[PDB]
A = this chain, B = another copy of it.
Amino acid sequence: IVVTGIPGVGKTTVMQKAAEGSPLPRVPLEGVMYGVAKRMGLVKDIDEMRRLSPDVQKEVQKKAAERIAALGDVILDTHCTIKTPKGYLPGLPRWVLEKLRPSVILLVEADPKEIYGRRLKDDSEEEIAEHQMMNRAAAMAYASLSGATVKIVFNHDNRLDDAVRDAAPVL
Q: How many A residues face the partner with a CB closer than 8 A? A: 57
CB distance from A81 to the nearest CB of B (A): 8
Can you show 20 pairs from A to B with CB atoms below 8 A apart?
A22-B31, A23-B31, A23-B46, A25-B27, A25-B32, A25-B35, A26-B27, A35-B72, A38-B72, A67-B71, A71-B71, A86-B104, A87-B106, A87-B149, A87-B170, A88-B151, A90-B144, A133-B136, A134-B150, A141-B145
A125-155 at interface with B (beta carbon < 8 Å): 130, 133-134, 136-138, 140-145, 147-152
Interface check A30, CB cutoff 8 A: yes
- Determine the chain B residues whose CB is within 8 A of the CB of A152 once the complex forms: 87, 130
Q: Which residues of A contact B (CB under 8 A)?
A: 16, 22-28, 30-32, 34-36, 38-39, 46, 67-68, 70-74, 81, 84-90, 92-94, 104, 106, 130, 133-134, 136-138, 140-145, 147-152, 169-170
